[PDB]
Design a protein around this ligand. Structure first.
Ligand SMILES: OC[C@H]1O[C@@H](O[C@H]2[C@H](O)[C@@H](O)[C@@H](O)O[C@@H]2CO)[C@H](O)[C@@H](O)[C@H]1O
Ligand SMILES: OC[C@H]1O[C@@H](O[C@H]2[C@H](O)[C@@H](O)[C@@H](O)O[C@@H]2CO)[C@H](O)[C@@H](O)[C@H]1O
Lengths: 478, 380
């Protein structure tokens, strides 16, 4: 108080911060408190069940909040917010059971080393759950819908084997504003919801995380907005690591906001997700370990960019991220379904085998980009052409092999343009080829070898197949 | 537990025993660094209080321990006979006032599986303090680190012994490359799911304690650059101004080298090429040797050497193949000097050569390689 004295907090919304405790602004008087099987019910409409504030080292077992009065939640004897906790480092909640209406449990600020084990938190049904407005939450969380567990301001409670039911948002977690401190830790959550109603399971704001999936979960009914994860403004240095087993049924994995990918698949057991689920937004995946697929399928007519693309029955639609996707899952080939797959800006092609009845087209004067060594093969495609730009722009100094066994038309441009001091081998097999020069370079000498085996080629350049910036190692024509 | 010298000590048979949510703290860290552990393995001779000590084959499971104000959070020794006894710590919450600490995990002759929870630190001594200290862990041992590193910079690892055993298993490094230090890179055995595009070198201002993967914290020597690039999948090496030198044969990763620095092999040493791919020196202030052949190739895989800078091997060769090799050498502009561009120690090595510069030893245009090399192409 102003005079210097202290008054017990009676304000319902108040919770002490670590700062408050350091400022002398707050002094906790909560120690040596132990709870075993306490059952707490409230009249409908009561704001908060339990305020676990300043309870460092305090413990709980079988704390049970809320009554399953009946089907209508508006008249059920449970609180809007089950539990609100802060300044409780080292506290332990064993087998906590909460029946809530708006928010299950909220953990804010200092809770270092605190654990919540085998919690069973559930909204009493999901009826109108999507309309509940979170009461205690981080500023970055502006969506409407009930939230089973909310965590922010640097709280890093360990969640072990929680069972979360009937929630719009299973977990909403924000890292500390200043440095993204506060790891989101959930080990094997058992997530379920009637009629598959759900918005997100893990809504992560400015944070890192380590989550192990237990083969249990789902994503909501909205074909566009609902996803297991939503990564909002997670920093470039953050990582949201996913381990374990994906749900049996198809789900949409991730959506987000922000300029940095942070999701990591760490030996994640994908089950049949490639065939029945969706990645959602590939942009947010940072890296993949121990998850491989042989082929990436593209369908410019019937594809869907929400798909993983690694299963033939669920191809993606555009070429934008094909290099990224092949790098992530180590794909050995790309299959182009019938139709023209097109780009309007410079796009990287992975060094793999391209096959299928589709065609590749570079429009708006764009070029396909080769940024890695290896062999790029176009086999039996309906052709590849550009509307004016060079077909392949090489920006790697590593050995590049280009193997075209389909029709090739670069018009007045080159099939290959080396932007560096390159090392390229190009080989055209049958079909046809057209270009002003097969291989060229922007400057300082590029070594190349060439084989052109087709009668349908620009015969006028047989004697001079490459520009002056390219020196030939071999030339097999005629 | 509130203690003065040692919090808890676990010895010999404790199979399947568990210690969950332990809260162990010294009552403050004043003079904590002067405590002498009472019950400890013979291999632990350091001075300082120890929160948890384990040895003689004890393998207690520590789940979410909270450890405070300790010089040493954990001291663990594997069994003397066969290194039996896995050190298991899941999500430790480690803190200490004033950042005072010596080591969090002091591991002797053992393996370990540790998951970090984004909480921790390393001591104030810029040379000796480190999260891990691996003492004589055997070749077959693995000390695996998963989870999130602390937010603030820390020195990750130091050790004694001849075998690297640390493993970064998808470890979330945060901003450690920029604000922290690896400490002693020798002790890292392998890395999974952690990458960096560029390794930075600075022979004048660099510090070998650094990771080297962030431009503001470059390393200093060339000794471990191949190992670092292999570990983190770096695509290039940036040489800050000054001469980066070796005095013993040292391997160079097959990547793009850039920057104003120069490369120099002294004491008759050579740069080693032990992997296929393309080694590119682009725009450097030059590469030269004081007498040894410049690049010694010991791999039979296709090797491309792309030099776009000044090259001077003096009376020696630019490339010497120690095996039956397959090499493509291309010198671009600048200048090149040597007695032969490529040579081989024995039974024929195939090679392709391109030299585009007027400043070269014209006298060997007609015989650019020794007798043990057969040319696939020659563009001069
Ligand atoms: O090169 C820097 C980018 O790396 C991308 O990750 C790659 C990863 O390096 C590679 O090993 C493989 O897993 O493919 C990934 C993506 O295709 C990052 O996603 C990107 O952020 C950059 O850091
Ligand atoms: O070749 C044996 C050595 O491997 C080194 O690890 C390599 C690893 O093989 C490679 O995959 C990548 O991770 O680069 C590492 C560079 O260290 C071990 O460190 C070394 O002890 C040997 O086993």
């Amino acid at each position: 108080q102003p005079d210097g004295s202290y008054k017990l907090n009676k304000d319902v919304d108040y919770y002490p911060t670590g700062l408050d405790i350091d400022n002398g602004d707050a002094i906790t008087c909560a120690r040596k408190i132990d709870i075993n099987n306490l059952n707490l019910i409230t009249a409908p409409g009561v704001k908060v069940g339990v305020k676990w504030i300043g309870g460092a080292g305090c413990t709980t077992k079988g704390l049970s909040i809320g009554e399953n009065t009946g089907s209508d939640i508006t008249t059920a004897r449970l609180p809007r917010v089950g539990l609100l906790q802060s300044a409780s480092w080292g506290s332990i909640h064993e087998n906590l059971r909460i029946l809530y209406k708006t928010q299950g449990a909220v953990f804010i600020d200092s809770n270092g080393g605190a654990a919540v084990n085998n919690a069973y938190i559930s909204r009493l049904g999901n009826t109108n759950g999507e309309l509940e407005q979170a009461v205690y939450k981080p500023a970055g969380f502006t969506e409407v819908g009930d939230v089973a567990v909310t965590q922010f301001a640097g709280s890093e409670v360990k969640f072990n084997s929680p069972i979360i039911e009937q929630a719009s948002f299973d977990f909403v977690h924000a890292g500390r504003d200043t440095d993204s401190y506060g790891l989101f830790m959930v080990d094997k959550p058992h997530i379920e919801s009637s009629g598959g109603k759900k918005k997100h399971s893990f809504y992560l704001i400015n944070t890192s995380s380590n989550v192990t999936l237990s083969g249990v979960g789902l994503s909501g009914q909205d074909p566009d907005l609902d996803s297991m994860y939503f990564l909002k403004n997670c920093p470039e240095t953050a990582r949201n690591v996913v381990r374990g087993q994906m749900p049996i049924s198809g789900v949409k994995l991730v959506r987000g906001t922000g300029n940095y990918p942070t999701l990591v698949l760490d030996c994640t057991n994908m089950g049949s997700q490639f065939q029945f689920g969706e990645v959602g937004d590939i942009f947010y995946i940072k890296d993949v370990v121990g998850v491989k697929a042989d082929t990436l399928y593209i369908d410019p007519v019937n594809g869907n960019n929400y798909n993983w693309g690694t299963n033939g029955t669920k191809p993606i639609r555009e070429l934008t991220n094909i290099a990224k996707i092949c790098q992530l899952f180590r794909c050995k080939s790309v299959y182009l379904n019938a139709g023209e797959s097109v780009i309007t800006s410079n796009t990287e092609l992975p060094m793999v085998v391209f096959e299928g009845p589709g065609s590749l087209k570079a429009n708006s004067g764009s070029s396909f980009l080769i940024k890695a060594g290896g062999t790029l093969s176009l086999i039996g495609l309906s052709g590849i052409s550009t509307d004016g730009g060079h077909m392949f722009r090489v920006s790697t100094v590593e050995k590049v092999n280009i193997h075209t066994n389909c029709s090739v038309n670069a018009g007045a441009a080159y099939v290959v343009l080396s932007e560096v001091q390159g090392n390229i081998e190009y080989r055209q097999l049958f079909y046809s080829v057209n270009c002003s020069k097969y291989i060229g370079a922007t400057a300082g000498q590029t070594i190349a070898g060439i084989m052109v085996k087709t009668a349908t080629r620009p015969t006028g350049i047989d004697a001079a197949p490459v520009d002056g910036n390219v020196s030939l190692t071999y030339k097999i024509i005629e």
